[PDB]
Structures are given as C-alpha cells and as structure tokens.
Amino acid sequence: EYPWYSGNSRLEDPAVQGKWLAAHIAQIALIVFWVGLNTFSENQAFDTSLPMFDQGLVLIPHLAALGFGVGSGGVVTNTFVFTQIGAIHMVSSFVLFGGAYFHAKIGPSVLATDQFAFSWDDPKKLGYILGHHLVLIGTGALLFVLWIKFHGIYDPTIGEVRTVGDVVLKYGWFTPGYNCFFVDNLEDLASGHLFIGLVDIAGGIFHINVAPLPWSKVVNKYTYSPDGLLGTAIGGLALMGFISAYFCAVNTLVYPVEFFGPALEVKFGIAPYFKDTADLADGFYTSRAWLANITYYLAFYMLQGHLYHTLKAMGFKFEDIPAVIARDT
Amino acid sequence: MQTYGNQNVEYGWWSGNSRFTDFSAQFLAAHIGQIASMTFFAGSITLFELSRYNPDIPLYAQGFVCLPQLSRVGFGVGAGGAVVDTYPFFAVGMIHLFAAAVFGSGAIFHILTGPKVLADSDSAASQRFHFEWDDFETQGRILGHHLLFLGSGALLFVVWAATHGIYDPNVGEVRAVSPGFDIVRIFKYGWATPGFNPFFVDNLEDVMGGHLFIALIDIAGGIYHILVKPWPYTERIFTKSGEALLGYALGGLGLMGLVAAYFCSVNDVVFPVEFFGPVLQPNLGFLPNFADTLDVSASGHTSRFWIANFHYFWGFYCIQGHLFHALRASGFDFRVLTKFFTTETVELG
Amino acid sequence: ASAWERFCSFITSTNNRLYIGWFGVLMIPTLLTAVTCFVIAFIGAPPVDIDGIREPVAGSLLYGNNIITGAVVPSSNAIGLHLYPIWEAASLDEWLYNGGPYQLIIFHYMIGCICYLGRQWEYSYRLGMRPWICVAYSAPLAATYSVFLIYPLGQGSFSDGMPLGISGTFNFMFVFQAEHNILMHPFHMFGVAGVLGGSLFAAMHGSLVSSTLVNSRSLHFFLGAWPVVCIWLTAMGISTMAFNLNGFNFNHSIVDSQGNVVNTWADVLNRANLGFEVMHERNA
Amino acid sequence: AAGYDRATTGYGWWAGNARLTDLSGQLTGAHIAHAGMITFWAGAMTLFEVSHFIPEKPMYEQGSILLAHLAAEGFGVGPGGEVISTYPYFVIGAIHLIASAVLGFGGLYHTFRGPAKFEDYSDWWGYDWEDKEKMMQILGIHLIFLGIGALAFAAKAMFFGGLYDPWAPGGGNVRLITNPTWNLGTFLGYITRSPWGEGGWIVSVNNLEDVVGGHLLVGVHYIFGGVFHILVKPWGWVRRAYVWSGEAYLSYSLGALYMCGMIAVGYVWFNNTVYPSEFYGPTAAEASQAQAMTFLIRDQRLGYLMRSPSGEIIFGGETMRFWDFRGPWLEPLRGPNGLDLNKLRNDIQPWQARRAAEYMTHAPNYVSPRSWLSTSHFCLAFFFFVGHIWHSGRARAAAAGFEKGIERKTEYALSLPDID
Numbered sequence A: 001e002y003p004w005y006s007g008n009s010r011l012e013d014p015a016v017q018g019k020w021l022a023a024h025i026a027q028i029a030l031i032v033f034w035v036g037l038n039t040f041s042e043n044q045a046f047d048t049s050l051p052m053f054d055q056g057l058v059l060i061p062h063l064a065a066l067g068f069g070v071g072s073g074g075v076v077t078n079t080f081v082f083t084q085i086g087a088i089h090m091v092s093s094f095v096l097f098g099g100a101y102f103h104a105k106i107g108p109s110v111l112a113t114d115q116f117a118f119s120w121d122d123p124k125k126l127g128y129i130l131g132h133h134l135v136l137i138g139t140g141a142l143l144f145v146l147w148i149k150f151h152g153i154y155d156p157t158i159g160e161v162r163t164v165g166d167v168v169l170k171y172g173w174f175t176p177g178y179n180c181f182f183v184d185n186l187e188d189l190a191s192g193h194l195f196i197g198l199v200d201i202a203g204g205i206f207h208i209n210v211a212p213l214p215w216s217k218v219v220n221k222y223t224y225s226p227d228g229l230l231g232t233a234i235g236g237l238a239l240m241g242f243i244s245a246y247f248c249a250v251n252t253l254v255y256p257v258e259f260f261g262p263a264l265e266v267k268f269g270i271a272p273y274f275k276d277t278a279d280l281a282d283g284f285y286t287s288r289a290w291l292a293n294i295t296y297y298l299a300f301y302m303l304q305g306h307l308y309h310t311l312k313a314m315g316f317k318f319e320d321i322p323a324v325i326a327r328d329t
Numbered sequence B: 001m002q003t004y005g006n007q008n009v010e011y012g013w014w015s016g017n018s019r020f021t022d023f024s025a026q027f028l029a030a031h032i033g034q035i036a037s038m039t040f041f042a043g044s045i046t047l048f049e050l051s052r053y054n055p056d057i058p059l060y061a062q063g064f065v066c067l068p069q070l071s072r073v074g075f076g077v078g079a080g081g082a083v084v085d086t087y088p089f090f091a092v093g094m095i096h097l098f099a100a101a102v103f104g105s106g107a108i109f110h111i112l113t114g115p116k117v118l119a120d121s122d123s124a125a126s127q128r129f130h131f132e133w134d135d136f137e138t139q140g141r142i143l144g145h146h147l148l149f150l151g152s153g154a155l156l157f158v159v160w161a162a163t164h165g166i167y168d169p170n171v172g173e174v175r176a177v178s179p180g181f182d183i184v185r186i187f188k189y190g191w192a193t194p195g196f197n198p199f200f201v202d203n204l205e206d207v208m209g210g211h212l213f214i215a216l217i218d219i220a221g222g223i224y225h226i227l228v229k230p231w232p233y234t235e236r237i238f239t240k241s242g243e244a245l246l247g248y249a250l251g252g253l254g255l256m257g258l259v260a261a262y263f264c265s266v267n268d269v270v271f272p273v274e275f276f277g278p279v280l281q282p283n284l285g286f287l288p289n290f291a292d293t294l295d296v297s298a299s300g301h302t303s304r305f306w307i308a309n310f311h312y313f314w315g316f317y318c319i320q321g322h323l324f325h326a327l328r329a330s331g332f333d334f335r336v337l338t339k340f341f342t343t344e345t346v347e348l349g
Numbered sequence C: 001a002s003a004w005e006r007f008c009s010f011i012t013s014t015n016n017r018l019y020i021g022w023f024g025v026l027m028i029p030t031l032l033t034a035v036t037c038f039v040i041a042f043i044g045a046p047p048v049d050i051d052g053i054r055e056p057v058a059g060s061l062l063y064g065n066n067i068i069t070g071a072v073v074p075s076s077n078a079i080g081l082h083l084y085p086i087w088e089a090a091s092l093d094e095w096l097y098n099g100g101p102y103q104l105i106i107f108h109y110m111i112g113c114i115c116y117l118g119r120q121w122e123y124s125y126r127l128g129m130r131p132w133i134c135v136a137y138s139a140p141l142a143a144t145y146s147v148f149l150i151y152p153l154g155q156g157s158f159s160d161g162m163p164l165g166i167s168g169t170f171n172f173m174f175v176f177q178a179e180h181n182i183l184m185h186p187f188h189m190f191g192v193a194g195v196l197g198g199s200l201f202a203a204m205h206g207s208l209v210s211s212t213l214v215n216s217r218s219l220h221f222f223l224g225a226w227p228v229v230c231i232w233l234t235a236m237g238i239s240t241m242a243f244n245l246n247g248f249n250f251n252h253s254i255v256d257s258q259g260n261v262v263n264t265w266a267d268v269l270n271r272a273n274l275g276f277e278v279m280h281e282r283n284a
Numbered sequence D: 001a002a003g004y005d006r007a008t009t010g011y012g013w014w015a016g017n018a019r020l021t022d023l024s025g026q027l028t029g030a031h032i033a034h035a036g037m038i039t040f041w042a043g044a045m046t047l048f049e050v051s052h053f054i055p056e057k058p059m060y061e062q063g064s065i066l067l068a069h070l071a072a073e074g075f076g077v078g079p080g081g082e083v084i085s086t087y088p089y090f091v092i093g094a095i096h097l098i099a100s101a102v103l104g105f106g107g108l109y110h111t112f113r114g115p116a117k118f119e120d121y122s123d124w125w126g127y128d129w130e131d132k133e134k135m136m137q138i139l140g141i142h143l144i145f146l147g148i149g150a151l152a153f154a155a156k157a158m159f160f161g162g163l164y165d166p167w168a169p170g171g172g173n174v175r176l177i178t179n180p181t182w183n184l185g186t187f188l189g190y191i192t193r194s195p196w197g198e199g200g201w202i203v204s205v206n207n208l209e210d211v212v213g214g215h216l217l218v219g220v221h222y223i224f225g226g227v228f229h230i231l232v233k234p235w236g237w238v239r240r241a242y243v244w245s246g247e248a249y250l251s252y253s254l255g256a257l258y259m260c261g262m263i264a265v266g267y268v269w270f271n272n273t274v275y276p277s278e279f280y281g282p283t284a285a286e287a288s289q290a291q292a293m294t295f296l297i298r299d300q301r302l303g304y305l306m307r308s309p310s311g312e313i314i315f316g317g318e319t320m321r322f323w324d325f326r327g328p329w330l331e332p333l334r335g336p337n338g339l340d341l342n343k344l345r346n347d348i349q350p351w352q353a354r355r356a357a358e359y360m361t362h363a364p365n366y367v368s369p370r371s372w373l374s375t376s377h378f379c380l381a382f383f384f385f386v387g388h389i390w391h392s393g394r395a396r397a398a399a400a401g402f403e404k405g406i407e408r409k410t411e412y413a414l415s416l417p418d419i420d
Ligand code: CL7
Pocket: D013, D014, D015, D016, D017, D018, D250, D254, D383, D384, D386, D387, D388, D390
C-alpha cells in the first residue's frame, strides 16, 4: 500500500498493469502537448526585427536551425511553419490522450493481446521490447538523415540552408582533428547520424532476434526489477542530458549564433554553470544559456534520482535512516 | 582493531569507523570511496581553478595548486611558462571527474552487494579476495599487486616524458627528455655526496633516470612479493593486526609528506619558478615554517608556500597518528594516563 | 557533585543573603560597573563638550557643582550613536572630554536593569510563586529605556539623552516640552493620571486596611495593574515622541469671521514653548 | 452547549481562548481565521490607498504605506520613483481579498463544522503539545514554507522585474539584480558588525546585491533546517533545556517576534536602500544633511563644512551627528576623506539639487511613513516583550505545578533556614 503523494507507486503493481501503460501514453501526450502550446505563446511574443537570442524563444531557434523560415541567414519570413508544427504536435496530443483514456478505464485492467503483456522478470520480453524501441529510434535518426539529404539545414559557414565519409572511428578517439563537441561540418553531422541510425536499427534487430545472454546476465545484478529498470533508464537519461548540455554550450554549427547567441563559457563556483560571453542587457540571457543550464541541472537531478531508485532497487531502505541516527544519538 | 582484552567493544559514532575493521567487503567499499574522493578533488578543483584563471596575473600569485601541476607536466604551456591553450586542463579535470564517478559507483556497489564479510559471499571467486588481519601471505600478494600498479605509474610517467615531452625551466619550454640510466649517479644521489644532493636535482635527465629506476624497483618488488611469502623474522618483528599495518603505513606516509614538503620549498627544476613561485626558506621558531622569500604585499602567497606548509603539517600529524596507532597496536591503553597524578605506576605493555 | 554542578547549586541556591541566579550573574558586574563609574564621574570629571562645539560644560562636584546642580553630562554631539569604548579613544583626556563616562554608565545600567528583571522572575520561580512581579517591574524599565536609549535613537545622538543629574533631568524635561509639547500628548496625561491615581489608591487602601485591622482579590489586582498600565502608556508616549510624532496642537484654531485670530490658552502654551525653544538652539 | 462555560473549563470569559488549548480542530480554525483577517486587512488597505492615490503628489506626501512596500519591489514604478499605473496594486489587493475569503471559509469550517479534535479523525493532523517529535516536524514543515518564500523573493529580484534600486545612476531605477553576493566573509562581516553607531548590525546594508544574496542564503538554510527538523529527534540536552507545552511554544514565538519587531523598527528608521527615500520619504539623517546641503547651495550661489572627529570633511552644526550618513543623491559628491568642498563647488547635478530641497521640506503637520511605522512597531514590539515574559513565566510555573497559588499546608518558604 502507498500514500496518495506516492500514488504512482500503486502502478508498480502487476495486478493493475494496463492502467500503468496508460500513464506513459498520457505523459507523451503531455510532452507533445507542450510542444504545441509553448510554440504558440512563443509565436505570439516573437518579434522578427530583434535578434532571435534575446526573448524567451527556445523552440523557435530549434526550428530555425532546421530550415523552416530562414534564407540568407538572420532571415525570418513566415511564422506559419512554426504554428503548423505546433498544431501538428498538439493535434497528435488529442490522439495520445484518447489512447491513454482507452487503456486507463476502458481497456483491460491487466494485460495478463497477451503478446504485449509482460512481467518484470521476463528477459526475452524486455529484449524484444528493447529491440522494437531501438528500431524506432534508429528510424527517426535515418529520417533526420533523409531530411539532411533532401531539405538541408541552415549552415553558418555557407550562410544558408544546404543539403548533403565515415571517419567516425576517429571522432570516437577524440583525436585533435575531432572532439565531436566541436563539429563544424554538415557532412560530419549527416554521416554520424547515418551511422547511429544504422547501429540503432542493427541493435533493435538483434534484441528482438536474440534473448539476453548469460555473460551479460552476470553483471546485471539487480536490474531485472521495476526499481532497477527505472534506475538504469534514469541514469541513461542523465548521461544524455549532460552530453546535450555540453553540446549546446560549446557547439556552434548545430546551434547557430544567429538564433542561439554566442558560445558559453564554462564557469564553476560551488557548482558548475555556463556564462554568456555576450554583451546582453542586464537581467537577460541568451536562449543558449537557458537551454544549457536548465538541461544540465535537470540531468544532474536525474542522476540523483537514478542513485535513489538504484539504491532502492538493491538491498537498501531509506526509511531506516532516522532509526540509525536514533541509535547513535 | 585493538580491543584491549575485552572483545566486542562498543564504539561511539565519533570513533564509529572502527566498526567495520572485520568486514572485508565494507573495508573494500570504504577505501574505493576514499579513492573516489581523491580523484574527484583533482578534477573538480582543476575546474574550480580554471573558472577564475587570469592570464594577466602570474600563475603563482593567484591561489592554485592544480594549474601549476598540470602546466609543469606539459599540457598546454607555451614558451616561458605561458598558458597558451586552457582546454587540456579542462580535459584532464573532466577525465578525473569521470573516474571519480566510476570509483564511487564501485564503492556503493560493494557497500550493498553481498555479505559484510567476503568469506561468506557465494561468488566463489570473490572469496579469492577475502583477507585476514593475521595472514602475511595474502597481504604480501596484495602488497605486490599494489607495487605493480605504482611501478606501472612511474613507467607511464617515464614514457610520457619521453614522447610528449615535459616542461624544463632550464631549457625554458616543453621538451622531450631522454631517460637517463646511471646506477652510479643514482647511488651518488643516495649518499648525497657533495656534487649531488637529492633535493637540489638540476637536470630533468637525472630525474627521469631515477624514475626509470623507481619503476623497475617497484615492478620487481611487486613480482617478488606476489611470488614469495614473508620470511619468518618478519613475523617475529611485526605484529599481525590491522591497526599495526595502519601504523606502518602512517609512518611511511608521514615521512613521504615531510620529504615532499621539503622538496617543494627548495628544488627549482621539478617545481619551476614561473609556475609555483620563487623558492621558500625553512624557518624554525616554535614550529617549522616556510617563509615566502617574497614580499607578500599585494601578492598573497605563492602556491609553493601553501603546498609546502600544508604538507609539512600533513607529514607531522601523520607521524603523530602513526605513534598513536603503533602505541595502541603494541598494547598500550591510554586510559592509564588518568592515573598520572596518583601513586599508581603509569605503565603497561 | 561535579564541580560544574556544585557551582550551579551555589548560584541557584536560596541560602545566600542575596539571591544571585543566572540573571544575577550578569546583573552584578554590570551594576557594579555602572555604580562605580557614576560615583567617580559625579564626584570629579572634566567638563564635557555637550554641544560638540569645542566649548565644554562641567557637571562634577570638584568642578564647582553641588548635588542639586551636578550631573553626568551626555556624550558629545559629534559622537552620534557611535559606541565610544576607552580602547577606541585617541587619549584618555580626550575620551573624557567627549563624554564617554555617560555612555559607559547608561549601557551597563540598562543591561543591569533588564537582568534585574530576569532575576526577579528567576527567584519567584525558585520560591514557588506566580511569576508576575517582573511584569509589573517592566513599566519603570520601559520608562528608563525610553529616556536613555530610545529617545537618543530617534534623535540620532546620545547628546539628546537624559543627563544623569537632578538639574539635568529638569533641563531635559523643559527641552523636551519645547520641542515636542509633551503636556498636550494624551499618553502623558494617562501617565499623570496613573501616578496621581496610584497615590490615591495607595492612600485609600492603606487607610482602609489600617483602619479596620485595628472580589477582594480583584482589589489588589487593580492596585497592581492601574499604575503599571499607565506607566506603560506614558513610556510608549515618550517613545513615539522620539520619532517626531508629536502630541496635540491647537494653535491658531479660532478665527474671527472677518479674518482675525482670537487667542486661546493653547496659544499661550505655544508661546511659552516658543520661549523655551528659542532659548535653546544655540545657532540656526 | 458544553465546555463553553467557566465551570467546565475554569477560565473566565475574558480568558476564553485559553479553553482552546487542547481542542486541536477549533484551535486550527482560529489560526486560519486570524490569517484570513491579516490578509483581508492587507487587501482592503491596498484598495483604499489605491482609490485615494494621486499621481502628482509623492507617496510620502500623499500618506500611503502599503503602496510604498509594493513600490519598493517595483510593481508599476519607473525611474526616479515615478508611478506608471496603479493597476498592479489593485491586482495585489484583489488577490489578497479573495485569499482572505477562502481562509475565512476554512476557519469557520474548522471552527464549527469540521472535527473538534483531529486526534479522533486522524493522527497526522492529531497532535498533542507534549509530543516533541511531532512539534519538531511541524516546525520543520513551516520552516520549509518560509524558505520557499525567501527564495521566491530572490527569484523575483533576479528574473521578474527586480527591485527599485535607488543607487542606480541619475536617481533610482527599477533593476534586475544579476550579481548576487555570496562570499561568506561579507556575510560574517554583516553579522558581526557592531549594532551601535560603529556601523550597523544588518540595518547597514546599502546595495541590493547583498540583499538578494542574503535572501538566497537564508532560503537555502530554511529549507535545509526544515528537512533536518523533519528527519531527526530532539537531542537529550534539548529535551532537558526547554519546556514542552503549548504556552511555552507561544512564549518562544513571542520572544522571537519582539526581537523581529525591534529590528524592523531599526530598518524602517535608519535604512534608505530597502526603504527607498523616494517612497517613504527621507530619513532623519537624510533630512538633516539635505537641509545642510541646500543651505550651502544657497550660500554658494550668493557668494558650511568642518572637520570630523577623525578629520574628514563633514557638514557643520547639529548635522555633525549624521556625519557618516551615505545617500544616493549625496554619494556622487564624495571623496577619499569626506565630501570635498571643490566637488560641491561644481558637481551638483540638477536632480540632486532638487532632491535636497524636496527632502528638506519633508523632514520626519506632516508625519512621514517612517514615523508611523517606527512608532507603531516599537509599541507592538514592547508589548510583545511583555507578553513573552508573561507567557514564559506562566509556562514555567504551570509545568512546575505551582501556577494556581502557593499551597497552604506545604509552603516552601516555610522550610528554608532563616538567613538571620
Ligand atoms: C500584553 C501582553 C500580551 C501579549 C502581547 C500577548 N498576550 Mg496572551 N493569551 C493567549 C494567546 C496569545 C497569543 C496567540 C499572543 C500572540 O499573538 C498573545 N497571547 C500575546 C491565550 C492563550 C490566553 C487567553 C486570551 C483570551 O482568552 O482572551 C483574550 C482577552 C481579551 C480581553 C482580548 C481583548 C483585548 C484587550 C481589550 C486589549 C485592547 C487593545 C486594542 C483593541 C488595540 C486597538 C486600539 C483601540 C483603542 C482602537 C492568553 C492570555 C493572556 C493573558 C494576558 C495578561 C496576556 N495574554 C498578555 C499578552 C491572560 O490572562 C490569558 C491567559 O493565558 O490566561 C490563562
């Protein structure tokens, strides 16, 4: 049994499984819902004349990087594309809400098709689920690659949008002609994205095809559990967030100075942060600073939550902590 | 531990770290955590210093302990001790932080993995790691492995100085250094015959040769200790207990800390002037000090000052802690001190 | 019988001739310091530049004054609210010249007074009685803190504090009347009613008891409460006047129909205040 | 009805609230209703002062105090202490009135309808005074709320409009603080500053960076302390060094409130930074120095300074008592050792010369907002000191047992050895 503030722990029960699924659907809807809503407000408050890195526009610069209303650079000519994208996301939200409600109270209480039905300790089930999600992720990566091939994204060195070699095995070694966090070539971005999409699809095929092996069942001491699985996912998320924050802070090819502002300086007081290196008005920060700092600190607390859930997954109980401090008064 | 006579002693939380002296898994966990703390300090402090670096101010004037140490060993220093590119310091600190995270993960892993004792764990191969506070064979093998790691580290330093180069204040710029090898000159530095004084080494070639020698010695000793059980006389002399080994290690560390403290204040080659600052002078009032030999007016203290004084104190109090732990492990209980002002003799084993 | 326990049992003990207690631990040194410095600076002490104008004003016995006219002059006008410890002084003679002894006395005395209130509570506790003598004592405490601490704070310098002397008190009263018209402030009227009525009720109660002795509890409650409440009110009145929130003012109230002004008693009172004020204010 | 009479409680009607000591639900209702009263007063007074506001006259001439608090936070103000539109004041007042309505509803509901003693309904809300852990946890929760509030104020000062900084160039201006102070040496220098004229304890803060950093620091500490209270037990010595009853906790709160009231009086009377003189009017020091400088301006136009006790350049006369006063309109005419005469000869910009006379007229007929606040809260602080003493003594006696009188047959004084 769980209290109301910890109410979602009730979904941990395999007794009510499908409702659990509903929650996740709802989350994604909410996520994509925000993608609409935010943009709309941004499109309301976005002045065209001002530099795009002054007012609170985060998604608008992201679209600007992906073409979408940019010409010779520093060019805004149609705010209708942004509204179109936001509307698409917000409309998808309604579908996802419908599915969430179908599983929440209309669908079965417990999945126990049954092919979707799984258990917390069924490594083949999780293996095939993992394969399918990897296949979709790699598919999205290859879709981005196709977008590069056909539409082509903004480039600062060329000053305009443009469409498009695997030395990735050297980028991975961070050889001085590398340190991917400093990529400045569209071909590098496209080739690496092709590579990651291919590898993701290969891994998805493999995981659907092949069950978890004993050699890797040795190391996974406790992750075959709800808390363990959640913890590993959260840790992965935190890792990704750190990498994205560093990319946003440093990289300028992907994040152009036009819509994001100049690069950030990494500073450290008691805790790390990123400073503007831009002569913006006092009290204002470039969108790049907002993105990097909020992303980084969200990832940091994701790491803390990963530690919490992982500790709870192994043999540890936090409610014992005061009792210990009771004995050693 | 010690537990004079009465076993199952109860420790307060202030002395609560003596509770796990008998739990091998927890012992491992504590020490992995400590090493994580050390490497985390290295990386995080590197970044903390990089944040406030001023190219205008000379390096030693500002309060640093890590930028001079990195700049000494290559790592983005131009001619005349100029910090040209400040990115390699960032890379070094970042690698240190990643290593710290790995170590801390291992620490929590062992603190929660299995039984407190490593004998009971049914891993059947972790039981290969359970040790005792009495058996000198296993501890000899452990000593051998750790010496192997130290020798491998000295070798890595030799290689990195041979290939990447290393700063040379006498040359005035980063430069590859030929690894010397002259056992005669090594021993002449051992005797401190008038030409060669160990704390006044002038050529990085001599330093490199000595490091090559140290690497060879450590690797050979590691092999020897892994293969060979301790001789009986070493069982006659040394007591076999955990606190005794802590005492031995503490004495060694105190000596090394004092040596490094004296090294910082005097040698100019291995501690270049442009990075750490001008040499200190040892003073002795009530307690030893290192005078800056420079006007602290509007310049604070050089980094060499801070390093030398901190490590003098670290060495001294490591010696005092060694005395405390050796006195306990030999059998002396300090409660008898309370009997000082009485007619009862203040003395036992 | 730990040494600390023995000490505590000594101080918090009801067998001393005078109770000490933890509050008395602070009370005794501060009161002794204040008394000693007051005696010394009242017998003999140099003239003090009260106006901060390099011109001194004497107040000691050895410099000519007697008990009625002697006083301890407030610290100099130039110091303001600055604490002036001896060790923070250029020279001892100068430190006297600026009026440091006044500061020493008043600060030690105020700390001792508040600790004396605490000591009253503490002994009431130790004897097993309801602990509300201190509440009654809090009224004159408030009055002293008003004249010595709060009024200078509102006025920005201790030079406006009350002198420690019989004639200094009267000079303070007249300057206060000149600058704030305290008589026509209702809180001082409450205070006057409080003291006069307290004397009336004391005389009545004493006469009744001593005549018949040859809810009745509420009688003694009212005796205790009345003057205390009135003194609280008048202390608060002084404190408010320390922040330029002056009393009533009815000058120039009645005017003739054509436009002339007909005098009332308030105008006479204002003219008296004018005289007191213009004799004050050395320059302008 | 039962328990609402003297016989069934022992308390006369004039001490009626005492009966509420052990009736958890009704006591909570009373607290909620009283909070509703406070916020109702806030909203109602805000609306009144807005309805009577006059844009030409200054706030301090106009006679508004709740408006000046909002003006300091910069709600609808402009450079030089000028209002732009009194709408946000109306917004705040209306929000407070609505919140008061909700709180009053909750208070009535718990007073009459809801459970009388939460102990019967549940146990998280059922509390007894002599449960030390429960009281610790409740204190911790409310500490966390205070910490969130302080951090909210800092966040407003840093991202949402900021505060009216009266040290901005050319008179005050609404600013957003971007460089909060966080050096601990500054914080210790503030705490261990002399409360006397030798500086000022915390009242001597003069820049807004220190204010924002201080609120950041205190909010962090409040959240941490609340968590600590929730997670730990009272130490043995703590359990042995307090009194554990409702009245004792009330007395502790009274003492804290008395201290805070005195400090607030000090702030409102000596501080011109967090109480901008543009709104509350000049302080006494500011008024005296402005009068001196305006007379000096007139005397230099038609064709007086002196040395400090430390030897600087200061004004002359009574105003020497304010020799160390620092002000925004006076600071530009400073020097290494006091305001130089040469600077005063040709450095008086027009707005400073206007502020000097504007402050000289309004020396605290006319009563400054500072006078009202200072007098009212000094009286409140004194009476809360008296209440602290009353309730602390009562708590100590009642815990001991001799609160209702001395026992006739076991009187303690009758057993002590005569001192003579
Ligand atoms: C003045 C000193 C004082 C302070 C400041 C104070 N108390 Mg008490 N106080 C309580 C709470 C309290 C709280 C929550 C609190 C802080 O917020 C305070 N107190 C504070 C209750 C627990 C308990 C019961 C109180 C109770 O049941 O009823 C209160 C009784 C009355 C008549 C309230 C009417 C107020 C007076 C008419 C004052 C008028 C002021 C004026 C309107 C202001 C505006 C100006 C105007 C002219 C326009 C209590 C008591 C009591 C007393 C006494 C003497 C006090 N007090 C005194 C104080 C009980 O006998 C009595 C007691 O404990 O007996 C056992």
